[PDB]
Amino acid sequence: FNAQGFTDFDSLSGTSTTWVNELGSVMTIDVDRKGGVTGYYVNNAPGTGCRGLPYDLSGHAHGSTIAFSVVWSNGIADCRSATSWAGYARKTFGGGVQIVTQWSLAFVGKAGGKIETGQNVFTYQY
Amino acid sequence: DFDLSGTSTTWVNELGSVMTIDVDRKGGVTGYYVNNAPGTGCRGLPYDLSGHAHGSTIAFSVVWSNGIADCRSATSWAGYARKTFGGVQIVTQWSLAFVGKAGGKIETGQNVFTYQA
Ligand SMILES: O=C(O)CCCC[C@@H]1SC[C@@H]2NC(=O)N[C@@H]21
Ligand SMILES: O=C(O)CCCC[C@@H]1SC[C@@H]2NC(=O)N[C@@H]21
């Protein structure tokens, strides 16, 4: 792969790439030829659980847009939580690459079922 | 409750969208989404869906391109299982990503899926 060449999420078709957000959480995504997204997310987000373990990641990317989800369970830690990202590619004028996302986090607290929301921007890294 | 492994299940939301999901051994989710939301594109044909369920939580993703019709957008839902009075409900927040005349926008809202056997 090359960030120079990056056109849209088609530029990933058949590539392995690592992406860090502003919280230092890292996803390592395998994009297949037909736009299927598999790999692992590492939460390193302060203030939150299940940090620094691999969590299975599945989604799809087409054109400028991408959606993917994690359930926070692998048989090691369970945070009783699932997270979903939808977003679009952004090409930096510096010739790097970004994914701008809204994430939804669903969990069941002492107060029962609840749904927290926010933004992550992931920057391509090697 | 989402701990479904071995079988398909059919869910329908307040917008009258249908999804049918296969939950593997791990808690992985494949299947198709069928949208019929008032005022949206890509209504009535199926789109691939991927995600994961475990315990009282699930998350799944649909890109709206199936080789037939493309609305150049993607949705992810995250949700929690609410027990009603046999069929479990999935209460969810969805984010919808599209690039338009005002570039990348990301709209949000809530969906309740209802089970059917
Ligand atoms: O604490 C939990 O309930 C489980 C881990 C949550 C990590 C969240 S997902 C939203 C945000 N983005 C990240 O990369 N980390 C946090
Ligand atoms: O209009 C588009 O960009 C493609 C179809 C999107 C359908 C949305 S996804 C959120 C909401 N929930 C549904 O079941 N349908 C709409």
Coordinates of C-alpha atoms and ligand atoms in Angstrom, one line a residue:
Chain A
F1 CA 0.0 0.0 0.0
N2 CA 0.9 3.8 -0.2
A3 CA -0.9 6.8 1.3
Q4 CA 0.2 8.9 -1.8
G5 CA -1.8 6.5 -4.1
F6 CA -4.8 6.4 -1.6
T7 CA -7.9 7.3 -3.7
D8 CA -10.7 5.9 -1.5
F9 CA -11.3 2.6 0.6
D10 CA -10.8 0.7 -2.8
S11 CA -7.0 1.6 -2.4
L12 CA -7.0 -0.9 0.6
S13 CA -8.6 -3.8 -1.4
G14 CA -6.2 -6.7 -0.5
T15 CA -4.1 -4.8 2.2
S16 CA -3.2 -4.9 5.9
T17 CA -3.0 -1.5 7.6
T18 CA -2.7 -0.1 11.2
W19 CA -4.7 2.9 12.5
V20 CA -4.4 4.8 15.8
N21 CA -7.1 7.2 17.1
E22 CA -6.7 10.3 19.4
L23 CA -7.1 8.0 22.5
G24 CA -4.2 5.8 21.3
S25 CA -6.6 2.9 20.5
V26 CA -5.2 0.9 17.5
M27 CA -7.0 -1.2 14.9
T28 CA -5.1 -3.5 12.5
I29 CA -7.6 -4.1 9.5
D30 CA -7.5 -6.7 6.8
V31 CA -9.6 -5.2 3.9
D32 CA -10.4 -8.0 1.3
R33 CA -10.8 -7.4 -2.5
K34 CA -14.7 -7.1 -2.2
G35 CA -14.4 -4.5 0.7
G36 CA -14.8 -7.0 3.7
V37 CA -13.0 -5.7 6.8
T38 CA -11.6 -8.2 9.4
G39 CA -9.0 -7.9 12.2
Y40 CA -8.4 -6.7 15.7
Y41 CA -9.0 -3.5 17.8
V42 CA -6.8 -2.6 20.8
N43 CA -8.6 -0.3 23.2
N44 CA -5.9 1.9 25.0
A45 CA -8.5 4.6 25.8
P46 CA -8.0 6.0 29.3
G47 CA -11.0 5.9 31.7
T48 CA -12.3 2.6 30.1
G49 CA -12.2 -1.2 30.4
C50 CA -10.8 -4.2 28.4
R51 CA -7.7 -2.0 27.5
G52 CA -4.7 -3.7 25.7
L53 CA -6.3 -6.9 24.5
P54 CA -7.1 -8.0 20.9
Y55 CA -10.9 -7.8 20.2
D56 CA -12.2 -9.3 16.9
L57 CA -13.4 -6.6 14.4
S58 CA -15.8 -7.2 11.4
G59 CA -17.2 -4.6 9.0
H60 CA -17.3 -3.4 5.3
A61 CA -15.8 -0.4 3.4
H62 CA -17.0 0.9 0.0
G63 CA -16.0 4.2 -1.7
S64 CA -15.3 6.9 1.0
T65 CA -17.4 5.1 3.7
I66 CA -16.7 2.4 6.3
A67 CA -18.6 0.7 9.1
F68 CA -17.2 -1.8 11.7
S69 CA -18.1 -3.1 15.2
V70 CA -16.4 -4.8 18.2
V71 CA -18.1 -6.7 21.1
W72 CA -15.8 -6.3 24.2
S73 CA -15.5 -10.2 24.8
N74 CA -12.7 -12.6 23.7
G75 CA -12.6 -15.2 26.7
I76 CA -10.0 -13.0 28.6
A77 CA -11.9 -9.8 29.6
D78 CA -15.7 -9.1 29.2
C79 CA -16.7 -5.4 29.7
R80 CA -20.4 -6.3 29.0
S81 CA -20.1 -3.8 26.1
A82 CA -20.3 -3.5 22.2
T83 CA -19.0 -0.7 20.0
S84 CA -19.9 0.4 16.4
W85 CA -18.1 2.9 14.2
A86 CA -19.5 4.5 10.9
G87 CA -17.3 7.0 9.1
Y88 CA -15.6 8.3 5.8
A89 CA -12.1 8.5 4.5
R90 CA -10.3 12.0 4.7
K91 CA -7.1 12.6 2.7
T92 CA -4.8 15.0 4.6
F93 CA -3.1 17.8 2.5
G94 CA 0.2 16.3 4.1
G95 CA -0.6 13.2 2.0
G96 CA -1.6 11.0 5.0
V97 CA -5.0 9.3 5.5
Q98 CA -7.8 9.5 8.1
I99 CA -11.1 7.8 8.9
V100 CA -13.5 10.2 10.7
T101 CA -16.1 8.1 12.7
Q102 CA -19.0 8.4 15.1
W103 CA -18.9 5.4 17.6
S104 CA -22.0 4.1 19.6
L105 CA -21.1 2.2 22.9
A106 CA -23.9 0.0 24.4
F107 CA -23.6 -1.6 27.9
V108 CA -25.8 -2.5 30.9
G109 CA -24.9 -0.6 34.1
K110 CA -26.3 -0.9 37.7
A111 CA -29.0 1.5 36.1
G112 CA -29.7 -1.1 33.4
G113 CA -29.4 -0.7 29.6
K114 CA -27.7 2.5 28.3
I115 CA -26.0 3.9 25.1
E116 CA -23.1 6.4 25.0
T117 CA -21.9 8.2 21.8
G118 CA -18.8 10.0 20.5
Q119 CA -16.2 10.6 17.7
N120 CA -12.9 8.8 16.9
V121 CA -10.5 9.9 14.0
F122 CA -8.1 7.1 13.1
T123 CA -4.7 8.0 11.4
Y124 CA -2.9 5.4 9.2
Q125 CA 0.6 4.5 10.5
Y126 CA 5.4 1.4 8.8
Chain B
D1 CA -29.5 -13.4 26.3
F2 CA -27.6 -13.1 22.9
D3 CA -25.8 -16.3 24.1
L4 CA -28.3 -17.7 19.3
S5 CA -25.2 -19.8 18.1
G6 CA -26.3 -22.4 15.5
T7 CA -29.5 -20.7 14.0
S8 CA -30.7 -17.7 12.0
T9 CA -33.1 -15.1 13.7
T10 CA -35.3 -12.4 12.0
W11 CA -35.6 -8.9 13.5
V12 CA -37.8 -5.9 12.4
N13 CA -37.5 -2.2 13.6
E14 CA -40.0 0.6 14.1
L15 CA -39.0 1.8 10.5
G16 CA -40.1 -1.6 9.1
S17 CA -36.5 -2.7 8.2
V18 CA -35.8 -6.5 8.5
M19 CA -32.4 -8.1 9.4
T20 CA -31.7 -11.9 9.4
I21 CA -28.5 -12.8 11.3
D22 CA -26.5 -16.0 11.8
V23 CA -24.6 -16.1 15.1
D24 CA -21.5 -18.4 14.9
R25 CA -19.9 -20.3 17.9
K26 CA -17.7 -17.3 18.9
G27 CA -20.6 -14.7 18.9
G28 CA -19.7 -13.5 15.3
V29 CA -22.7 -12.2 13.2
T30 CA -23.2 -12.5 9.4
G31 CA -26.5 -12.0 7.5
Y32 CA -28.5 -9.4 5.4
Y33 CA -30.2 -6.1 6.2
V34 CA -33.4 -5.0 4.3
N35 CA -34.1 -1.2 4.8
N36 CA -37.6 0.3 4.2
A37 CA -37.1 3.5 6.2
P38 CA -39.3 6.5 5.0
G39 CA -37.1 9.0 3.1
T40 CA -34.0 6.8 2.6
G41 CA -32.4 5.1 -0.5
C42 CA -31.6 1.4 -1.1
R43 CA -35.1 0.2 0.1
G44 CA -36.2 -3.5 -0.3
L45 CA -33.0 -5.3 -1.6
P46 CA -30.7 -7.1 0.9
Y47 CA -27.2 -5.8 1.9
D48 CA -24.4 -7.9 3.7
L49 CA -24.3 -7.4 7.5
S50 CA -21.3 -8.2 9.9
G51 CA -20.8 -7.8 13.6
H52 CA -20.6 -9.6 17.0
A53 CA -23.0 -10.4 19.9
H54 CA -22.2 -11.6 23.4
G55 CA -24.1 -11.3 26.7
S56 CA -26.5 -8.3 26.7
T57 CA -24.7 -6.5 23.8
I58 CA -24.4 -6.6 19.9
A59 CA -22.9 -4.4 17.2
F60 CA -23.3 -4.8 13.4
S61 CA -22.4 -2.9 10.2
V62 CA -24.1 -2.6 6.7
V63 CA -22.4 -0.8 3.7
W64 CA -25.2 0.1 1.2
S65 CA -23.6 -1.5 -1.9
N66 CA -24.8 -5.0 -3.0
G67 CA -23.7 -5.0 -6.7
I68 CA -27.3 -3.9 -7.5
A69 CA -27.9 -0.5 -5.9
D70 CA -25.3 1.7 -4.0
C71 CA -26.4 4.7 -1.8
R72 CA -22.6 5.5 -1.2
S73 CA -23.2 5.2 2.6
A74 CA -22.6 2.9 5.6
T75 CA -24.4 2.2 8.9
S76 CA -23.2 0.7 12.2
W77 CA -25.6 -0.1 15.1
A78 CA -24.5 -0.8 18.8
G79 CA -27.3 -2.1 21.1
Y80 CA -28.4 -3.9 24.3
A81 CA -31.0 -6.7 24.7
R82 CA -34.2 -5.6 26.6
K83 CA -36.4 -8.5 27.8
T84 CA -40.2 -7.8 27.0
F85 CA -43.2 -9.9 27.9
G86 CA -40.4 -14.7 24.8
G87 CA -39.0 -12.3 22.1
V88 CA -36.1 -10.1 23.2
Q89 CA -35.7 -6.5 21.9
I90 CA -32.4 -4.9 20.7
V91 CA -32.4 -1.2 21.7
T92 CA -29.8 0.6 19.5
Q93 CA -28.0 3.7 18.3
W94 CA -27.0 3.8 14.6
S95 CA -24.6 6.3 12.9
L96 CA -25.1 6.7 9.1
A97 CA -21.9 7.9 7.2
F98 CA -22.2 9.4 3.6
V99 CA -20.0 12.0 1.7
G100 CA -22.1 14.7 -0.1
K101 CA -22.1 18.3 -1.4
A102 CA -21.1 19.4 2.1
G103 CA -18.5 16.6 2.3
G104 CA -18.6 13.8 5.0
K105 CA -21.7 14.0 7.2
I106 CA -22.6 11.5 10.0
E107 CA -26.3 11.3 11.1
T108 CA -27.5 9.5 14.2
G109 CA -30.7 8.1 15.8
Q110 CA -32.2 5.1 17.7
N111 CA -33.6 1.7 16.4
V112 CA -35.5 -1.0 18.4
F113 CA -35.3 -4.4 16.7
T114 CA -38.0 -7.0 17.7
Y115 CA -37.4 -10.8 17.3
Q116 CA -39.6 -13.2 15.2
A117 CA -39.2 -17.1 14.9
Ligands
LIG1 O1 -14.9 0.4 28.8 C1 -15.7 -0.3 28.1 O2 -16.9 -0.4 28.3 C2 -15.1 -1.2 27.0 C3 -14.1 -0.5 26.1 C4 -14.6 0.8 25.5 C5 -13.6 1.6 24.6 C6 -14.2 2.8 24.0 S1 -15.0 2.3 22.4 C7 -15.2 4.1 22.2 C8 -13.9 4.7 22.5 N1 -13.0 4.5 21.4 C9 -11.9 3.8 21.7 O3 -11.0 3.4 20.9 N2 -12.0 3.5 23.0 C10 -13.2 3.9 23.6
LIG2 O1 -30.2 6.3 2.6 C1 -29.0 5.7 2.7 O2 -28.0 6.3 2.8 C2 -29.0 4.2 2.7 C3 -30.1 3.5 3.5 C4 -29.9 3.9 5.0 C5 -31.1 3.4 5.9 C6 -31.1 3.9 7.3 S1 -29.8 3.1 8.3 C7 -30.5 4.0 9.7 C8 -32.0 3.8 9.6 N1 -32.5 2.5 10.1 C9 -33.0 1.7 9.1 O3 -33.5 0.6 9.3 N2 -33.0 2.4 8.0 C10 -32.4 3.7 8.1

